[PDB]
Each structure stands twice: as structure tokens, then as C-alpha cells.
């Protein structure tokens, strides 16, 4: 089973992919997801990316408290007291983002589907 595995999955109301965990196989090609922000949905495997961390050189969308969000490229990982941090590079410079500060646009997620998709 996939229960307990960290994933990145599509939130279908806005088309973005967010980090979370599979918590149960609910059949019919779907999995119960506890997203890192607390919300759940039974999601199709085809909309789930089984990839933790998000791989190096992956184009992602990086969030921030002080600036509007945009696309960057993963260039590093770092683990500290049990938490994952990403090093994202935009227009040359690199910066660090918590796991919840990294999401994928619809197309960014659709790109990883062939290699990491559960469907």
C-alpha cells in the first residue's frame, strides 16, 4: 500500500499541486490525502505525484510572506530537525523555502506525471 507516503497532489479547485500524505487507499483509483495545510480529499492516483522531495531541476512555484509568488527551479534540499527546505533559484539568485512554501502549477505538476504519477 501507499499509506503514509509523502506526496505532492493536485487541488482540483485551483489546479495547483500541494504537499501532503496519503492516509488510506479508498479504492476506485483514489487515495485519501491529508494535505499539509490540514484539508482532505479523496484524490485520483493520476493527480498524485509520488515524489518526496520534489526532485532537483524541477520547475516549481515558490511562495513567500513578503512577495507575490512565481516560478523557480529546485537547486537544493536541506533537512533540519525533521523538516525539509528547498533551495529555489529565480533569475540567478537562490533562496530557501519551507516545504509548504513550494507548490506546483497545473502544468508543472502535469510534467512530472509520467515519471512520478500514481496514474
Amino acid at each position: 500500500s501507499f499509506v503514509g507516503l509523502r506526496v505532492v497532489a493536485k487541488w482540483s479547485s485551483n489546479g495547483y499541486f500541494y504537499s501532503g500524505k496519503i492516509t488510506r487507499d479508498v479504492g476506485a483509483g483514489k487515495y485519501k490525502l491529508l494535505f499539509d495545510d490540514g484539508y482532505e480529499c479523496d484524490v485520483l492516483g493520476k493527480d498524485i505525484l509520488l515524489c518526496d522531495p520534489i526532485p532537483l531541476d524541477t520547475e516549481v512555484t515558490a511562495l513567500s510572506e513578503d512577495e507575490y509568488f512565481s516560478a523557480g527551479v529546485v537547486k537544493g534540499h536541506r533537512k533540519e530537525s525533521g523538516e525539509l527546505y528547498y533551495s529555489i533559484e529565480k533569475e540567478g539568485q537562490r533562496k530557501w523555502y519551507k516545504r509548504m512554501a513550494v507548490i506546483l502549477s497545473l502544468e508543472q505538476g502535469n510534467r512530472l506525471r509520467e515519471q512520478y504519477g500514481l496514474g
Binding site: 487541488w11 495545510d37 511562495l63 513578503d66 512577495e67
Partner: peptide
């Protein structure tokens, strides 16, 4: 909490 797309 980050500036992020509407959810």
C-alpha cells in the same frame, strides 16, 4: 502563511 493562490 504566504501570498499564494486562492484556495
Amino acid at each position: 502563511i504566504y501570498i499564494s493562490p486562492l484556495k
